Design a protein around this ligand. Sequence first.
Ligand SMILES: O=C1CNCC2=C1[C@@H](c1ccccc1F)c1c[nH]nc1N2
Length: 251
Amino acid sequence: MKRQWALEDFEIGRPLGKGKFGNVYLAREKQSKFILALKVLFKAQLEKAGVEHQLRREVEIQSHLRHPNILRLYGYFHDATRVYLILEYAPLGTVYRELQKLSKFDEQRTATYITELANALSYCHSKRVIHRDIKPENLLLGSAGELKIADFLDYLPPEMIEGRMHDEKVDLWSLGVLCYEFLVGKPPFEANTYQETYKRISRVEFTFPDFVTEGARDLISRLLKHNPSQRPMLREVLEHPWITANSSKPS
Ligand SMILES: O=C1CNCC2=C1[C@@H](c1ccccc1F)c1c[nH]nc1N2
């Protein structure tokens, strides 16, 4: 038995973002006056893209995922032309926005974010869910500034760009790219052309600015190993001395 929702159940507020298949609006559940986000997806568009099978899968997964660092999907409903997703609202915005505003994050903020991401990823893996698109734009912030994964090129691991087969280790690579981008302000393999970025990733060619410390370099270099089996386990990330020295939050 489940709860049935309807459009008339919410007071539509301001638009929060624009999607390639619809828009997201801030909203309030009329009964509880609870603030949430309402993502509207157009079927006609979801159809003309062959991503419907992807949405159905993601919605199934998200509904079952319950973690403080994963954006919550409370439910959904639809009509003749639209699919509505009832999502948790992250009042502090995207990590992407904070990064652009600050240009780069200090070690404390970065290690904290990496810890929250590692926890969320560890939870996902325990549920056989892998390959989360954790780019800054897909990372939101809760009322206390806690990170929330909301993924529902510069970040693809060597195995993927090379058309090879992969596993959960792709998420460890992602974590290394994010740790670097958080500390530096830009992803490690950024280049002028797609072709150049590709060769940069394939060869794991990147440099560290002078302000990136020894501990951060050790963690990033280990996460960004070309060979997936040489990348640390998520528990090793959470126990890394750079993480335990800088994270403002425990695992
Ligand atoms: O789209 C946006 C735009 N940035 C603010 C924001 C959202 C939205 C959202 C982000 C990523 C994926 C799905 C999704 F609905 C959102 C949901 N809760 N808080 C949000 N803030």
